[PDB]
Amino acid sequence: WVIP
Amino acid sequence: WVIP
Amino acid sequence: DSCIQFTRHASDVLLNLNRLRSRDILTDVVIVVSREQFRAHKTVLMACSGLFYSIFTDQLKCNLSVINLDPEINPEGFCILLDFMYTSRLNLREGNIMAVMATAMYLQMEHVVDTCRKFIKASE
Amino acid sequence: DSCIQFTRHASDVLLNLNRLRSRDILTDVVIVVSREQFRAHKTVLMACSGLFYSIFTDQLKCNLSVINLDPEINPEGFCILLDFMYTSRLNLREGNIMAVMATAMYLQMEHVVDTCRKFIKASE
Ligand SMILES: O=C1Cc2cc(Nc3ncncc3Cl)ccc2N1
Ligand SMILES: O=C1Cc2cc(Nc3ncncc3Cl)ccc2N1
Ligand SMILES: [Cl-]
Ligand SMILES: [Cl-]
């Protein structure tokens, strides 16, 4: 999971 | 396009 | 093999599937949640959720145009997860995390259940 | 927004759609190419091809279960492109590049037409  |  | 691969292909496909959803093009099922209705494509639901995969591979249920979820399922939690299915983006907030995790457990969306568990553990 | 994003989501969705194709699950159309038949999902074809997008948004053709391609279309070129649609992988070879490019131009798959043009230019 990432900060888009 | 890339070499997978 | 000796294939070449287009890096953005999968993301572009999903973006186009979400455009079809927005315009209600070729949607083939209604998901009913506490009298809130969500139109979608069975194949996308199956590709994202162990529950929908099981439902639409059933010889009788594969032909249903309406699926009613358990009354304990929260419509907002479902909406957030449906958006995630079609975008890879999850709108996880302090005010919705419990409903989102409960909905992801029911829908069998293991990666979502994982990030919810981790975000909850960080706040304890 | 303040969404989080699961990097592998789009690729995992496409992998699952290809698994449904392999097992012939919820395929809703046959594409006929020079008497060779290919089963697929209309939504995936639309998401990948300007031609299929135009075909299945037509109020009459959206309801067809069989689509016949122009007789000039090569079945192997189509097969290679159908595999690319469902995998992001393109089996481009000296022996098939001309058929693949011609099929991608007909199907309106701009990124494929682009890499074929470049691979042809490198050999001239
Ligand atoms: O967490 C998850 C996400 C998910 C998706 C599916 N879908 C499929 N699996 C395998 N072949 C085809 C399909 Cl469509 C099944 C289980 C789970 N569990
Ligand atoms: O090269 C290409 C690939 C491609 C895909 C599509 N598909 C869609 N476009 C926009 N909204 C939904 C969909 Cl399904 C249309 C044109 C082209 N041209
Ligand atoms: Cl997930
Ligand atoms: Cl393309």
Residue numbers in the entry:
A (entry chain D), B (entry chain D): 1 to 4
C (entry chain A), D (entry chain A): 6 to 129
Task: Provide the publication's sentences verbatim.
However, specific radiation damage (SRD) can cause cleavage of carbon–halogen (C–X) bonds during X-ray diffraction data collection. This study shows significant C–X bond cleavage in protein–ligand structures of the therapeutic cancer targets B-cell lymphoma 6 (BCL6) and heat shock protein 72 (HSP72) complexed with halogenated ligands, which is dependent on the type of halogen and chemical structure of the ligand. Therefore, we embarked on a systematic study into the effects of synchrotron radiation on protein-bound halogenated small-molecule ligands. We conducted our studies on crystals of the BTB domain of the transcriptional repressor and therapeutic cancer target B-cell lymphoma 6 (BCL6), complexed to nine inhibitors from our drug discovery programme, which share the same core scaffold but have different halogen substitution patterns [Fig. 1(a)]. Using a multiple serial structures from one crystal (MSOX) approach, we observed X-ray-induced C–X bond cleavage of all BCL6 inhibitors and HSP72 ligands, with a concomitant loss of the anomalous signal of the respective halogen atoms.
From each individual inhibitor-soaked BCL6 crystal, 15 X-ray diffraction datasets were collected to monitor the changes in electron density as a function of the X-ray dose. In addition, our experiments suggest that the sensitivity to SRD is affected by the substitution pattern of the pyridine or pyrimidine ring in the BCL6 inhibitor scaffold. For example, the chlorine substituents in the position ortho to the –NH– linker have a similar sensitivity to SRD compared with the Cys67 Sγ and Asp33 Oδ1 atoms, as exemplified by the Dloss and Cα-normalized Dneg curves and max. In addition, these halogens are not adjacent to an electronegative pyridine- or pyrimidine-ring nitrogen. Support for this hypothesis can be found from the 5′ Cl atom in compound 3, which has a slightly higher sensitivity to SRD that might be due to the presence of the second, electron-withdrawing, chlorine substituent at the adjacent 6′ position in the pyrimidine ring, the only difference between compounds 1 and 3. For example, the enclosed nature of the binding pocket around the 5′ Cl in 1, 4, 6 and 8 may shield this position from attack from reactive oxygen species generated through irradiation of water.
